[PDB]
Design an enzyme around this catalytic site. Structure first.
Site, mmCIF file in Angstrom:
data_model
loop_
_atom_site.group_PDB
_atom_site.id
_atom_site.type_symbol
_atom_site.label_atom_id
_atom_site.label_comp_id
_atom_site.label_asym_id
_atom_site.label_seq_id
_atom_site.Cartn_x
_atom_site.Cartn_y
_atom_site.Cartn_z
ATOM 1 N N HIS A 49 0.820 -1.173 0.000
ATOM 2 C CA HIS A 49 0.000 0.000 0.000
ATOM 3 C C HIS A 49 0.874 1.250 0.000
ATOM 4 C CE1 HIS A 49 0.419 -0.909 4.302
ATOM 5 N NE2 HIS A 49 0.498 0.405 4.485
ATOM 6 N N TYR A 65 -3.724 3.943 1.854
ATOM 7 C CA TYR A 65 -4.681 3.460 0.873
ATOM 8 C C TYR A 65 -3.991 2.446 0.013
ATOM 9 C CZ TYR A 65 -7.513 7.200 2.599
ATOM 10 O OH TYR A 65 -8.166 8.019 3.523
ATOM 11 N N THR A 66 -4.782 1.501 -0.519
ATOM 12 C CA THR A 66 -4.222 0.330 -1.201
ATOM 13 C C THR A 66 -4.584 0.381 -2.696
ATOM 14 O OG1 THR A 66 -4.592 -0.824 0.831
ATOM 15 C CG2 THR A 66 -4.086 -2.152 -1.150
ATOM 16 N N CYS A 245 -8.938 -8.917 5.662
ATOM 17 C CA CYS A 245 -8.846 -7.466 5.721
ATOM 18 C C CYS A 245 -10.229 -6.866 5.893
ATOM 19 C CB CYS A 245 -8.216 -6.908 4.452
ATOM 20 S SG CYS A 245 -7.881 -5.138 4.576
HETATM 21 C C1 LIG Z 1 -2.916 -0.493 5.588
HETATM 22 C C2 LIG Z 1 -4.283 0.123 5.358
HETATM 23 C C3 LIG Z 1 -4.751 0.317 4.085
HETATM 24 C C4 LIG Z 1 -5.959 0.920 3.823
HETATM 25 C C5 LIG Z 1 -6.732 1.420 4.886
HETATM 26 C C6 LIG Z 1 -6.290 1.157 6.185
HETATM 27 C C7 LIG Z 1 -5.095 0.508 6.443
HETATM 28 C C8 LIG Z 1 -4.638 0.299 7.861
HETATM 29 N N1 LIG Z 1 -7.921 2.154 4.621
HETATM 30 C C9 LIG Z 1 -8.508 3.053 5.640
HETATM 31 C C10 LIG Z 1 -7.944 4.462 5.534
HETATM 32 O O1 LIG Z 1 -6.541 4.471 5.880
HETATM 33 C C11 LIG Z 1 -8.640 5.458 6.447
HETATM 34 O O2 LIG Z 1 -8.608 4.957 7.792
HETATM 35 C C12 LIG Z 1 -10.053 5.825 6.056
HETATM 36 O O3 LIG Z 1 -10.030 6.418 4.737
HETATM 37 C C13 LIG Z 1 -10.709 6.734 7.021
HETATM 38 O O4 LIG Z 1 -9.838 7.897 7.233
HETATM 39 P P1 LIG Z 1 -10.463 9.329 7.461
HETATM 40 O O5 LIG Z 1 -9.319 10.242 7.727
HETATM 41 O O6 LIG Z 1 -11.441 9.682 6.395
HETATM 42 O O7 LIG Z 1 -11.338 9.118 8.796
HETATM 43 P P2 LIG Z 1 -10.944 9.483 10.309
HETATM 44 O O8 LIG Z 1 -9.598 9.006 10.608
HETATM 45 O O9 LIG Z 1 -11.234 10.893 10.551
HETATM 46 O O10 LIG Z 1 -11.925 8.602 11.103
HETATM 47 C C14 LIG Z 1 -13.308 8.688 11.170
HETATM 48 C C15 LIG Z 1 -13.877 7.309 11.415
HETATM 49 O O11 LIG Z 1 -15.221 7.553 11.879
HETATM 50 C C16 LIG Z 1 -16.128 6.668 11.263
HETATM 51 N N2 LIG Z 1 -17.075 7.450 10.488
HETATM 52 C C17 LIG Z 1 -17.046 8.805 10.256
HETATM 53 N N3 LIG Z 1 -18.062 9.246 9.550
HETATM 54 C C18 LIG Z 1 -18.806 8.101 9.294
HETATM 55 C C19 LIG Z 1 -19.967 7.885 8.517
HETATM 56 N N4 LIG Z 1 -20.630 8.836 7.858
HETATM 57 N N5 LIG Z 1 -20.419 6.623 8.433
HETATM 58 C C20 LIG Z 1 -19.760 5.661 9.084
HETATM 59 N N6 LIG Z 1 -18.656 5.728 9.833
HETATM 60 C C21 LIG Z 1 -18.220 6.998 9.875
HETATM 61 C C22 LIG Z 1 -15.304 5.683 10.417
HETATM 62 O O12 LIG Z 1 -15.087 4.507 11.152
HETATM 63 C C23 LIG Z 1 -14.049 6.495 10.134
HETATM 64 O O13 LIG Z 1 -12.944 5.675 9.871
HETATM 65 C C24 LIG Z 1 -8.435 2.182 3.324
HETATM 66 N N7 LIG Z 1 -9.603 2.819 3.147
HETATM 67 C C25 LIG Z 1 -10.121 2.844 1.907
HETATM 68 O O14 LIG Z 1 -11.204 3.437 1.654
HETATM 69 N N8 LIG Z 1 -9.468 2.218 0.870
HETATM 70 C C26 LIG Z 1 -8.239 1.614 0.999
HETATM 71 O O15 LIG Z 1 -7.654 1.105 -0.017
HETATM 72 C C27 LIG Z 1 -7.717 1.564 2.296
HETATM 73 N N9 LIG Z 1 -6.430 1.049 2.504
HETATM 74 N N1 LIG Z 2 -5.190 -3.013 6.777
HETATM 75 C C1 LIG Z 2 -5.450 -2.834 5.476
HETATM 76 O O1 LIG Z 2 -4.664 -3.111 4.577
HETATM 77 C C2 LIG Z 2 -6.797 -2.271 5.088
HETATM 78 C C3 LIG Z 2 -7.112 -2.009 3.749
HETATM 79 C C4 LIG Z 2 -8.381 -1.551 3.421
HETATM 80 C C5 LIG Z 2 -9.334 -1.372 4.397
HETATM 81 N N2 LIG Z 2 -9.031 -1.686 5.689
HETATM 82 C C6 LIG Z 2 -9.991 -1.484 6.772
HETATM 83 O O2 LIG Z 2 -11.216 -2.086 6.378
HETATM 84 C C7 LIG Z 2 -12.288 -1.362 7.030
HETATM 85 C C8 LIG Z 2 -13.345 -1.103 5.990
HETATM 86 O O3 LIG Z 2 -14.386 -0.357 6.664
HETATM 87 P P1 LIG Z 2 -15.802 -0.147 6.006
HETATM 88 O O4 LIG Z 2 -16.348 1.132 6.515
HETATM 89 O O5 LIG Z 2 -15.756 -0.367 4.539
HETATM 90 O O6 LIG Z 2 -16.615 -1.358 6.680
HETATM 91 P P2 LIG Z 2 -18.122 -1.488 7.185
HETATM 92 O O7 LIG Z 2 -18.298 -0.793 8.495
HETATM 93 O O8 LIG Z 2 -19.036 -1.118 6.085
HETATM 94 O O9 LIG Z 2 -18.191 -3.027 7.519
HETATM 95 C C9 LIG Z 2 -17.950 -4.028 6.479
HETATM 96 C C10 LIG Z 2 -18.222 -5.384 7.077
HETATM 97 O O10 LIG Z 2 -17.373 -5.628 8.202
HETATM 98 C C11 LIG Z 2 -17.997 -6.550 9.075
HETATM 99 N N3 LIG Z 2 -17.978 -5.966 10.441
HETATM 100 C C12 LIG Z 2 -18.149 -4.656 10.797
HETATM 101 N N4 LIG Z 2 -18.334 -4.513 12.091
HETATM 102 C C13 LIG Z 2 -18.317 -5.802 12.608
HETATM 103 C C14 LIG Z 2 -18.570 -6.327 13.889
HETATM 104 N N5 LIG Z 2 -18.836 -5.524 14.942
HETATM 105 N N6 LIG Z 2 -18.471 -7.626 14.070
HETATM 106 C C15 LIG Z 2 -18.273 -8.422 12.976
HETATM 107 N N7 LIG Z 2 -18.041 -8.032 11.712
HETATM 108 C C16 LIG Z 2 -18.107 -6.718 11.586
HETATM 109 C C17 LIG Z 2 -19.407 -6.782 8.575
HETATM 110 O O11 LIG Z 2 -19.350 -8.039 7.855
HETATM 111 C C18 LIG Z 2 -19.616 -5.630 7.656
HETATM 112 O O12 LIG Z 2 -20.559 -5.824 6.597
HETATM 113 C C19 LIG Z 2 -11.678 -0.172 7.699
HETATM 114 O O13 LIG Z 2 -11.516 -0.421 9.109
HETATM 115 C C20 LIG Z 2 -10.340 -0.048 7.042
HETATM 116 O O14 LIG Z 2 -9.317 0.578 7.825
HETATM 117 C C21 LIG Z 2 -7.772 -2.088 6.050
#
Ligand SMILES: Cc1cc2c(cc1C)N(C[C@H](O)[C@H](O)[C@H](O)COP(=O)(O)OP(=O)(O)OC[C@H]1O[C@@H](n3cnc4c(N)ncnc43)[C@H](O)[C@@H]1O)c1[nH]c(=O)[nH]c(=O)c1N2
Ligand SMILES: NC(=O)c1ccc[n+]([C@@H]2O[C@H](COP(=O)([O-])OP(=O)(O)OC[C@H]3O[C@@H](n4cnc5c(N)ncnc54)[C@H](O)[C@@H]3O)[C@@H](O)[C@H]2O)c1
EC number: 1.6.2.2
Length: 272
Positions: A49, A65-66, A245
């Site tokens: 990523h 982001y990935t 993931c």
């Molecule tokens: C190694 C790795 C790689 C990736 C990712 C994580 C990691 C660890 N992520 C996640 C990404 O890094 C990032 O955490 C998100 O884009 C959220 O960051 P913000 O700064 O927008 O939210 P910020 O850090 O401000 O956090 C706000 C949090 O509040 C919650 N939230 C806020 N408003 C909400 C709403 N309207 N509905 C629901 N929940 C709400 C969410 O849980 C959100 O993450 C990702 N992400 C992605 O989209 N694509 C990718 O490819 C990746 N790749």
């Molecule tokens: N580490 C990485 O490389 C990487 C890459 C991309 C995304 N992510 C992570 O993936 C997540 C994607 O978030 P989103 O907003 O698309 O997801 P989301 O909140 O829409 O949830 C997606 C799914 O996750 C499962 N889940 C959520 N809460 C759960 C719970 N309490 N118990 C069991 N299963 C549960 C459910 O199956 C749900 O449909 C973020 O946390 C992001 O950081 C990590």
């Protein structure tokens, strides 16, 4: 020759220009950025990523982001990013910092990229180089099949691996994807995912679960569970690598205990 590399140094930040934004669904988009020339490649090993960085409201914000593109793609990088909007969810009034910054960018605006990063690299033909931690060397795992459990935007590293496998006709690795989202409309990249299924059914097994399902549904419903893992990932005796993931609770409660239950050992599992 070989193509010029964008991410030449992991400490350097590279400002890249936004050139296109495509809807994936109601909250998710595909952001395409130009590399420094149309002939460049990103320089990102499969599985890794990048990080984006920007000063938002006066404070530096960094997020990973990935990419879903690859080093075969000349001149661009694609990110698939869920926007967490303000003024929507009762628990998150402000929404997400970086994701909304990206949503607000105009075409021609720049943002800083850096990388590559990540403990896993897919080396092709079933070989995965995985570091146990950032300070240790990789170890190379060859497998015949790969289980993939993705939740929401956790699809992105999975799609990186799936695309890499499927484009090589001499890569016989079979990928089994179990993809979880909150509702049917939340499913990301369905079309793309389905086309891979169309064209590669012997190498690609696809299953969905949704937290709430519509009346018309032929897949699973609820959080990832033991049954889904048995039925839609390769069995333990086949010695697969299991990649996972998604949201932290998904990993902690849905994936880890159920992988124990089925008998996938921790040493053959990897969480992005
Ligand atoms: C190694 C790795 C790689 C990736 C990712 C994580 C990691 C660890 N992520 C996640 C990404 O890094 C990032 O955490 C998100 O884009 C959220 O960051 P913000 O700064 O927008 O939210 P910020 O850090 O401000 O956090 C706000 C949090 O509040 C919650 N939230 C806020 N408003 C909400 C709403 N309207 N509905 C629901 N929940 C709400 C969410 O849980 C959100 O993450 C990702 N992400 C992605 O989209 N694509 C990718 O490819 C990746 N790749
Ligand atoms: N580490 C990485 O490389 C990487 C890459 C991309 C995304 N992510 C992570 O993936 C997540 C994607 O978030 P989103 O907003 O698309 O997801 P989301 O909140 O829409 O949830 C997606 C799914 O996750 C499962 N889940 C959520 N809460 C759960 C719970 N309490 N118990 C069991 N299963 C549960 C459910 O199956 C749900 O449909 C973020 O946390 C992001 O950081 C990590």
């Amino acid at each position: 020759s070989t193509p010029a590399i964008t991410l030449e140094n992991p400490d350097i930040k590279y400002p890249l220009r936004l050139i296109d934004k495509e809807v994936v669904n109601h909250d998710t988009r595909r952001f395409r950025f130009a590399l420094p020339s149309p002939q460049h490649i990103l320089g990102l090993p499969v599985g890794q990523h990048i990080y984006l960085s920007a000063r938002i409201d006066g404070n530096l914000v960094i997020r990973p982001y990935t990419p879903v593109s690859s080093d075969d793609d000349k001149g661009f990088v694609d990110l698939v990013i869920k926007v967490y909007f303000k003024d929507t969810h009762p628990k998150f009034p402000a929404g997400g910092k970086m994701s909304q910054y990206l949503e607000s960018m105009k075409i021609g605006d720049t943002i800083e990229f850096r990388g590559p990063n990540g403990l896993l690299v897919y080396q092709g033909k079933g070989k995965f180089a995985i570091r146990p931690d950032k300070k240790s060397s990789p170890v190379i795992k060859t497998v015949k099949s790969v289980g993939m459990i993705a939740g929401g935007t956790g699809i992105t590293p999975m799609l990186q691996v799936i695309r890499a496998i499927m484009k090589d006709p001499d890569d016989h690795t079979v990928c089994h994807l179990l993809f979880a989202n909150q509702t049917e409309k939340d499913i990301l990249l369905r079309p793309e995912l389905e086309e891979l299924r169309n064209e590669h059914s012997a190498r690609f097994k696809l299953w969905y679960t949704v937290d709430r399902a519509p009346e018309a549904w032929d897949y699973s419903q609820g959080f990832v569970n033991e049954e889904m893992i048995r039925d839609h990932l390769p069995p333990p005796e086949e010695e697969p690598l299991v990649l996972m993931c998604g949201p932290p609770p998904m990993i902690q409660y849905a994936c880890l205990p159920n992988l124990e239950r089925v008998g996938h050992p921790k040493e053959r599992c990897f969480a992005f």
